[PDB]
């Protein structure tokens, strides 16, 4: 309403500090345990490591978001821009696709037990991550070639596209990211875990109910974290691209939604590894 601004940017810089350290320490701790003690000979630990590694590299980009919000410019050239963007995108899909194949692995484990023998092997887990490496590297190479700086008096770092001939490939790219990094994931992880519980509910007394309650609570939480963290920023980006506004509160809310996306990566070590009944022991 007035000239004096509220200390919201200080609060934002403080949340970023928590999410950054919690995420960087957490995921570095998980990898350390797997490298020095578990040796990742099982398919389970292979997923846990690759998720921890992807979430460890996504938090690496986080201080750049923090800095850009407060400075309101990218003065570090196109060379760093291309690097920071590619790391931010590549490991976003590597984080979300590993997270989704864990859902598919747990789904096949219960619903296709004979297939589980031929799918939940250390080799198969490795191949699945080699595929997740390829699918992400496509966006990674795209971020290295298209990433750059634009003068449109505050310097911006983003994927640069030609504006000629009523082009809309900036919007188009965002819709592809929205469906392959949120829509098909959310739906795959919702369908897989729902069908998984439905299978266990269809088993015929206290032992079944004890596991069903523990698993349903776990399932609700893991997807709740993915929905609570990615839904705000995916919608914000998509609506800003279809429209929106560039206010102070609108800029503050955007980087708060950015922080939520990084929160998913910071909670994954606690939600999947420091809750794994095999990783604790």
């Amino acid at each position: 309403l007035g000239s004096i601004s509220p200390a919201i940017p200080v609060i934002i810089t403080a949340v970023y500090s928590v999410v950054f350290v919690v995420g960087l320490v957490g995921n570095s701790l998980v990898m350390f345990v797997i490298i020095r003690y578990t040796k990742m000979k099982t398919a389970t630990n292979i997923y846990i490591f690759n998720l921890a590694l992807a979430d460890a590299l996504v938090t690496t980009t986080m201080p750049f978001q923090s800095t850009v919000y407060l400075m309101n410019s990218w003065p570090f050239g196109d060379v760093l821009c291309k690097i920071v963007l590619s790391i931010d995108y590549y490991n976003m899909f590597t984080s979300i696709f590993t997270l989704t194949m864990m859902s598919v692995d747990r789904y096949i484990a219960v619903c296709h037990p004979v297939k589980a023998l031929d799918f939940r092997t250390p080799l198969k887990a490795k191949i699945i991550n080699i595929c997740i490496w390829l699918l992400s590297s496509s966006v990674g190479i795209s971020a290295i070639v298209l990433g750059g700086t634009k003068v449109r008096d505050v310097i911006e770092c983003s994927l640069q596209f030609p504006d000629d001939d009523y082009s809309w490939w900036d919007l188009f790219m965002k819709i592809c990211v929205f469906i392959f990094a949120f829509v098909i994931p959310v739906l795959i992880i919702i369908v897989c875990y729902t069908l998984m519980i439905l299978r266990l509910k269809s088993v015929r007394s206290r032992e079944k109910d004890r596991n069903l309650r523990r698993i349903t609570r776990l399932v609700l939480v893991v997807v709740a974290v993915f929905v609570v963290c990615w839904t705000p920023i995916h919608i914000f980006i998509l609506v800003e691209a279809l429209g929106t506004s560039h206010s102070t509160a609108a800029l503050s809310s955007y980087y708060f939604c950015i922080a939520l996306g990084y929160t998913n990566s910071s909670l994954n070590p606690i939600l999947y590894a420091f809750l794994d009944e095999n990783f604790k022991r």
Partner: nanobody, 117 residues
Framework: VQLVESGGGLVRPGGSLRLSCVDS??????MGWFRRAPGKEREFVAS????????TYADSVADRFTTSRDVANNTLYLQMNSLKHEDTAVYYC?????????????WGQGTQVTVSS
């Protein structure tokens, strides 16, 4: 017989065997695998939770063997691939009563597995 064990016998070295243990009377849950070599003592092979989601494996066979549980048919499976002359043993099914980690209540009769020429 309570724990119905099958899928053993002779196999060529580097060959595969899918062991299966089922309790049709539903008096227990087959959730574990143990093996006893001609000389060596009782050795843990692999375990899995009631849900059939979390499979535990011994470092020795973790790389080759794969276990699964058919919650619907109350059946436990043990896929044994790239079988070496060290895997030749009597494989026992471990079942847990309906009424505590990696401890079984009902053992198996045995489904002797031989890896020879």
């Amino acid at each position: 017989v309570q724990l119905v064990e099958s899928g053993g016998g002779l196999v060529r070295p580097g060959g595969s065997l899918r062991l299966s243990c089922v309790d049709s009377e539903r008096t227990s849950y087959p959730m574990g695998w143990f093996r006893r070599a001609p000389g060596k003592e009782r050795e843990f092979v692999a375990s899995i939770t009631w849900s059939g989601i979390d499979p535990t494996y011994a470092d020795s066979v973790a790389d080759r063997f794969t276990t699964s549980r058919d919650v619907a048919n109350n059946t436990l499976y043990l896929q044994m691939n790239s079988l070496k002359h060290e895997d030749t043993a009597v494989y026992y099914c471990a079942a847990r009563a309906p009424v505590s980690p990696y401890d079984y209540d009902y053992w198996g009769q045995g489904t002797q597995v031989t890896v020879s020429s």
